[PDB]
Design an enzyme around this catalytic site. Structure first.
Site, PDB file in Angstrom:
ATOM      1  N   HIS A  41       0.836  -1.191   0.000  1.00 25.34           N
ATOM      2  CA  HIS A  41       0.000   0.000   0.000  1.00 25.34           C
ATOM      3  C   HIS A  41       0.869   1.238   0.000  1.00 25.34           C
ATOM      4  CE1 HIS A  41       0.599   1.025   4.282  1.00 25.34           C
ATOM      5  NE2 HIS A  41       0.324  -0.225   4.598  1.00 25.34           N
ATOM      6  N   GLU A  62       4.773   0.393   0.557  1.00 26.69           N
ATOM      7  CA  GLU A  62       5.196  -0.233   1.800  1.00 26.69           C
ATOM      8  C   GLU A  62       4.736  -1.677   1.821  1.00 26.69           C
ATOM      9  OE1 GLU A  62       3.587   2.144   5.024  1.00 26.69           O
ATOM     10  OE2 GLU A  62       3.436   0.331   6.254  1.00 26.69           O
ATOM     11  N   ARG A  85       8.711  -2.987   8.051  1.00 24.71           N
ATOM     12  CA  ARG A  85       8.328  -2.684   6.689  1.00 24.71           C
ATOM     13  C   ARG A  85       9.515  -2.343   5.818  1.00 24.71           C
ATOM     14  NH1 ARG A  85       4.614  -4.369   8.828  1.00 24.71           N
ATOM     15  NH2 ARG A  85       2.676  -3.315   9.476  1.00 24.71           N
ATOM     16  N   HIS A 101       7.389  -0.166  13.356  1.00 25.78           N
ATOM     17  CA  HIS A 101       6.516   0.330  14.407  1.00 25.78           C
ATOM     18  C   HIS A 101       7.102   0.106  15.801  1.00 25.78           C
ATOM     19  CE1 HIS A 101       3.200   1.234  11.737  1.00 25.78           C
ATOM     20  NE2 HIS A 101       3.066  -0.014  11.334  1.00 25.78           N
TER      21      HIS A 101
END
Ligand code: K
Length: 114
Positions: A41, A62, A85, A101
């Protein structure tokens, strides 16, 4: 830029092969396997974050960075994308960055892998 030999995403160390596998998985839109649900996306670069991309102009995409990839998932056979990612240039496949993250300001935030 060139894919690095290694990257450390919040304690998950990935190789150049892992990163290449992620990008090639993202780019594999030819019929057989299916493409994963929700990925690749668009990558949204947040002004308040400090991510440095090494590929120049967007558009950027990503895709999840996982061991023994590429990542796959569907609603029927779900696998978490995990925290890590690869970012790549949507039109050229050029590597841009690895981000995670893990250790970010919030659950949805990113910090750059090292
Ligand atoms: K495919």
């Amino acid at each position: 830029c060139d894919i690095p030999q290694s990257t450390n995403c919040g304690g998950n160390v990935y190789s150049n092969d892992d990163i290449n596998t992620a990008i090639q998985g993202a780019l594999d839109d030819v019929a057989x396997g299916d493409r994963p649900d929700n990925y690749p996306h668009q990558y949204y670069d947040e002004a308040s974050e400090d991510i440095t991309l090494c590929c120049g102009s967007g558009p950027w995409s990503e895709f999840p960075l996982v061991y023994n990839g590429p990542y796959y998932s569907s609603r029927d056979n779900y696998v978490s994308p995990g925290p890590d990612r690869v970012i790549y240039q949507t039109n050229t496949g050029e590597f841009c960055a690895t981000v995670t993250h893990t250790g970010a300001a919030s659950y949805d935030g990113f910090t750059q892998c090292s």
